[PDB]
Paper text:
The L-arginine biosynthesis pathway consists of eight enzymes that catalyse the conversion of L-glutamate to L-arginine, appears to be attractive target for anti-Tuberculosis (TB) drug discovery. The arginine biosynthesis pathway consists of eight different enzymes ([Fig fig1]) all considered to be essential for *[name]* growth *in vitro*. In this work, the ligandability of four enzymes of the pathway [name], [name], [name] and [name] is explored using a fragment-based approach. In conclusion, using a fragment-based approach, we have discovered inhibitors that bind to novel sites in [name] and [name] and to the active sites of [name] and [name], which in case of [name] show on target activity against *[name]*.
(A) Overlap of X-ray crystal structures of protomers of Apo-[name], [name] co-crystallized with N-acetyl glutamate (NAG), and [name] co-crystallized with L-arginine. In the conditions used in the assay, [name] with 5% DMSO displayed a melting temperature of 48 °C. The addition of 1 mM ATP, N-acetyl-glutamate and L-arginine showed positive melting shifts of 2.0, 11.8 and 8.6 °C respectively.
Residue numbers in the entry:
A (entry chain A), B (entry chain A), C (entry chain A), D (entry chain A), E (entry chain A), F (entry chain A): 4 to 294
The structure:
Amino acid sequence: IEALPTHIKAQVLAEALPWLKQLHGKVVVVKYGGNAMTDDTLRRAFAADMAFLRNCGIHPVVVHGGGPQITAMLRRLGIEGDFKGGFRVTTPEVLDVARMVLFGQVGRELVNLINAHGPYAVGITGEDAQLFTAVRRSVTVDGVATDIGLVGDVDQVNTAAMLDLVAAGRIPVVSTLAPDADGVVHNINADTAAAAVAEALGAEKLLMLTDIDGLYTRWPDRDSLVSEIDTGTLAQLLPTLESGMVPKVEACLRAVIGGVPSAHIIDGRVTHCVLVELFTDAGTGTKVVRG
Amino acid sequence: IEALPTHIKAQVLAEALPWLKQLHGKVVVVKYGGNAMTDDTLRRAFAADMAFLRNCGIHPVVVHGGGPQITAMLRRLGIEGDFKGGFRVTTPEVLDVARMVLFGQVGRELVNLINAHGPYAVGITGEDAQLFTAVRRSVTVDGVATDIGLVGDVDQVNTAAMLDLVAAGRIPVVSTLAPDADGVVHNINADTAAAAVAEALGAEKLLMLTDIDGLYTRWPDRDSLVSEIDTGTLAQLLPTLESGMVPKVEACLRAVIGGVPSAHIIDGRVTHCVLVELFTDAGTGTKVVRG
Amino acid sequence: IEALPTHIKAQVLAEALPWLKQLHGKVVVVKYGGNAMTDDTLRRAFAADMAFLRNCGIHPVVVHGGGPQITAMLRRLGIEGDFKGGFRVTTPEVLDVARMVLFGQVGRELVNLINAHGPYAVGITGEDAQLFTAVRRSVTVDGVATDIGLVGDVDQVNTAAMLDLVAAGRIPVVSTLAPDADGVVHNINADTAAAAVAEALGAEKLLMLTDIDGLYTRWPDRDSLVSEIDTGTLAQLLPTLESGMVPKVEACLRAVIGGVPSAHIIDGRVTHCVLVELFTDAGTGTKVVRG
Amino acid sequence: IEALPTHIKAQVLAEALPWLKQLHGKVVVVKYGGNAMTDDTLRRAFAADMAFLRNCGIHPVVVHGGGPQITAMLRRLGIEGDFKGGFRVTTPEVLDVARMVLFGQVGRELVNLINAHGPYAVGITGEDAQLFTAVRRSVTVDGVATDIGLVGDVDQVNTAAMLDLVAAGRIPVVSTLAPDADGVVHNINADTAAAAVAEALGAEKLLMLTDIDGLYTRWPDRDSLVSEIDTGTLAQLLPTLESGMVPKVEACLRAVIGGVPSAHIIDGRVTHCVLVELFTDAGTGTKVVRG
Amino acid sequence: IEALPTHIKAQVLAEALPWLKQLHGKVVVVKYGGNAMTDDTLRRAFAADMAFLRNCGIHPVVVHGGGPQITAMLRRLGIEGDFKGGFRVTTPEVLDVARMVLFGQVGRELVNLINAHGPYAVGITGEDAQLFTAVRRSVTVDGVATDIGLVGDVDQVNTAAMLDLVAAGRIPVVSTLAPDADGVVHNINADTAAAAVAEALGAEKLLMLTDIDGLYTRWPDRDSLVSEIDTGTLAQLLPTLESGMVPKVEACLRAVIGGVPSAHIIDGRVTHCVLVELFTDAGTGTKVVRG
Amino acid sequence: IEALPTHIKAQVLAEALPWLKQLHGKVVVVKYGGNAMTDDTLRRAFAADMAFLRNCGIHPVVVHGGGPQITAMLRRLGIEGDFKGGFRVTTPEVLDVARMVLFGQVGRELVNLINAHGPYAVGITGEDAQLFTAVRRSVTVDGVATDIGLVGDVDQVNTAAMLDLVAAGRIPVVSTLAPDADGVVHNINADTAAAAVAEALGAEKLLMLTDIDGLYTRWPDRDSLVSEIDTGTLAQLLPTLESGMVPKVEACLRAVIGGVPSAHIIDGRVTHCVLVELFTDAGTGTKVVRG
């Protein structure tokens, strides 16, 4: 980015202006996972983009996952799994490990990366200041709803206390664990938690970092790649999508139907994908709007 | 506490008044460890006492340890230790485990206990919002200062951001990990960190929960138990004390010399020891003042 | 309270916690009269309990009476009384004396007692900053409503200005005099004024200090002493109660029906009765709730 | 004021402008006593002028006396006086009467008069919120300093809490009683208290209402009437002035030497003397400045 | 105003009190034009009266015209006019001159005059901070509505930003130019703009300075001069009034019907007419109220 | 900017981050003149860049000139000039025209351009709220200091009121006219005024838009173009520079010596020069630092 003429650098920056205006002073919830979480270059760029948003007066809120790190630690601890369908059962023991890995390892890495740019990141779970609660969820397997232990969905969100934190200039980094109404902590799917946080905070956008170019309606036909789709059309397409994309699409559906103006499935394998999706018209991601 | 006449219950409460006046609106830093951390009755009472202080308009700040929980997890993970003197060397690997256990397990338990009473507790480390930094420390072994890895002392404290948190009505629960000036996270001894936080926050008291009645000057002579001692006298006595008491005494010395009006070594095996030490004249603990 | 074991002192304090949580940040209106007002030990303890509430972050508001002090001063001044039924007629002259005694003597004593603990108490009447107004009341005598001069009921309350005063950390001590809509100051019964202030301020509790154990439904049968009663049941019982208890019961009825969660008739002859009633389950008083 | 041409009414108002600019947002302490306190027309006009200042964004603070009302009440109560020199001895009994008359009668009348114009006036003594303290004073009689009981001078003033009250839009009406360092309430001379309040509050002016045209240097020579004098000249003249003027002059001296820009001795027998002195160049009063 | 006795000066000031109470803390919009704008004595007095209101805690907002100054500058620039009916057509060129004269000359003179008394005046147009917008208006000529270029009516007003300016202690001086919805700046009649600003700001009064004694219903019969009239009566009279008075009357109608409590047509040829109309009962102006 | 690969657009934006961090929450004063003021494309881009800074949480303050527009209007009005040396004498008449052109024409155009992006721009002069004052300046001609009328330098700046305006989210657009201590308005050179505003506001940068690539030390040698120079070196070079560059260089000297961290002479003929200079390392401008 050095031989590139200076009048072209100017145009690239100037074209950010309409999106800076759209997002100034607004909440943007970003689900962070996949290869954006595992490669040092993609990670460092993600943390820089969070600092970028913050130094534009945008209020990012990061919700992270960590499925494979949990599995890796359970295997290290010799904790034998129980599986119903394709789901590990989250016993009290598995929860303790999940919480310890998500909050004490995965979230720590991102907090420190972001904080290389300033005193921005702060880690939290639903446990802290009772910021949100969980309700136990069942899963459908072989056509029957089934209990797989201490896993849940976001129940209620302390919207005011959460926005107080971003008003202090902080970037919350959320590990998806929260107590139920009896104080018993559950693990929440990070994609669904991200949609719930976006709706509760009145976010202007929900970004979903995934390891794909975007939503293909007829995978693997390359021409089936769509760049914008409405919730009604997308809900009808949901039964036909691969297993990995369903939670990302359900998230976008719940968020946009919940009033979030747009949710985006963007390619987490692209360095600075957040900057590309937010401040550029050239993203490969797909945008979900209501309709 | 039922056959006890009602006019005696009244006198007990009324005698709390001078200490409520002393502490209203003031910061009290509490080092929490030992059996107060491991027994369910002592723990639940500790969490209730933190809620008590908060519902009196006192601002508690909890600094916790977790030495044995770390050791237990290292053994579970099969991480062979290296030892210089009696000190485990904190390699990058051992740090990751220490941080994950302290922040993702030990701190979580206390946060949830306290939060059974309200949205009070919030967990943090020096990493979050760069709340404090560490400087690597050496230890003296066989008369020579020696490096034992990523262990440090508190360097600087973001006093303003920390007090903003208690001003929100929060009870910080601090896990003693913090980055050095290069962003590399160190493990800090919880006793020393507690003294450093007390001094930086202008705390009115530092409480040190330990598993002993109090400071014995000539252990094990029962009559050597003292109830108040000045920093000058206590510094001269420090070379003669058992190994377990030195860090607790050094903490009290640094805090009180640092301007904290008093530091207290109190018996963490007594249910509601905090209430006893703060709102009663009948504590067995020992009080350190400057002189 | 010295030979009493330390673990019992701890339990007494710890059992205050649920009521500290209930009252933190809340308004508590206390009608103060009777022997609690005349004996030096009961008085000093009352003032200490007001300071106690204030140093817990509770907002006490004190409404005081002074019937007998007024009578005593009228006799000293040689002011001959006029009586309709059992009621002294409050001429302009009698009002001046009542106001001067209530505000310039009785209220002064309590303000100074409370202020021995800090800059808390502040005296006021409805006259000051037009904090409340009066409407002239008649009384029923021999079955006919009758004018007995410048006596009234609370008309309107400047809720906002009153709460601004407690927000400053002040403890208002209210002498029950207030202007009517024409600026003419009336004397208001202190029991009824206390209920009116409680309702207007959204108080969490109304305490009525009286010189009896509590409400007896069939005085003097000792077993008729009740510890909790609903407003509907109590309204039906009101025509059967002794003359001294009627104003205290009407007060509790108006307050609780007015939305105050509970009103309490407690024994003002018990040292620290406020502490006993608020922070203990062993009070002899009776609690009024809606039903 | 009806046949007077309209262009003359305009000029009178327009000439108020430089003094409105001088006083906007500033504290003005007014000592109120004499015939301005006893005649219904002068009183009602005084209260209106206090409302005038308040509705210009000026912050009046009223300090009142009441010597003769106290004497009258003592005689009504049959309280025999003890006299040293020309001074009544203020026994505990005489204090109670003084406080009750000053705060519960004299201050009440002014509060109600002012409040006919709005929720402005609020009565206070040094007792309330420990707004100020007293130190016992002796008097010189026949050349020897002598104790005459519970009479004092203002010791310390809670400047911040007092200015908080005027910031709320209130007009404090101060009765000059205050506790000493042991909580024992003393009666303070109202002229001296007014000067002390002016200095502590950083008042822009001190007004002293008296029943004379102004300072005569060689009473009763009519030409000895001066309209402005400096503190140095006036201090030298003080030993030669009549008994009634000394406290008013000592007050002006202490205030202006204390940094109050000017103190004024104005004729309280003139209806609306405050308006005349503050917003007009035609006052008969005398102005004291430093020099 | 020197031989006039001092007790008469006092009465004049004291009679201002009810209107100071009415206006304290309230917005007063003043249309300023005519001879009040062109004579140095009337101008300087107008600026002083704006400073007077400000130093009483009243919030004046000045809307100014400048018709003849515009004409004079157009003639100096040799800009030939086009006229439909009696209306100059406001071409883009004529607008530039109008804006430059109104904002860069006429408004500057008033700002500087007012600012001789303090940092009060601040000049603005609808362009600044998009404080208000315009909508293009047509005029009726020979019975047909006709376009006369870039002239409009106030469309929307940024009420909040405007009141923020007066809350800072500023006196806005408004030049009536504002952009339409496409950013194209229009010239707005100053009388109509003044009524629109008064209604949008919730003004307590609208003052209309004109070069006449007041509204004559049957000009030139001297007895037809009315001092107060309701909007319904005045609307019926509007078709019968001289050409110069129609815009002033339409303004008062729109304002008072828009909820402004009263609008006043006052004689701008009287020195200090504002002071006379606001703080005196002797104004020759006419008051419009709803009915 | 369309065929350019998306990973290059990302890198351009990401490289803005260190300068966004440097400028977030900081004041940047921009002198705007030259061709950046006269060409529609350069102007519209300048206004967009001001909106860009504002939507990043940067606080721009624009100081504008307008020399040639003034000359053009004087010629249109037939105002014959008087010239001493090469300086037009600013008579009272010439000032009125200068003020009317600068504030009522030139500043209006920029305000409206900026406001196409939001309610940002607000026009002001030193006259408004007495935001700054002028002191009359002389010029040196043929070796003698000479009066050329109502031209001056910035004297004092109301730093607090000016920063209150940018705190409201406003972008001040300053026309360089201000009253002297006697209220007489002077015209101030816009380059010098810009440096004075930067120093008084504690600006982080001063940008000087000019119609040259940057400072040439040995014009017209192309290799004499420097990209960074210290104040000491640059002061020594000042006597050797062309006439047009002297005011721009004196400005940078006064600002940087006045404590402004850096002042920049940048090429106003480059579209989006502000974006290029601030958020890019590829600017042709020259940076002045202290040394």
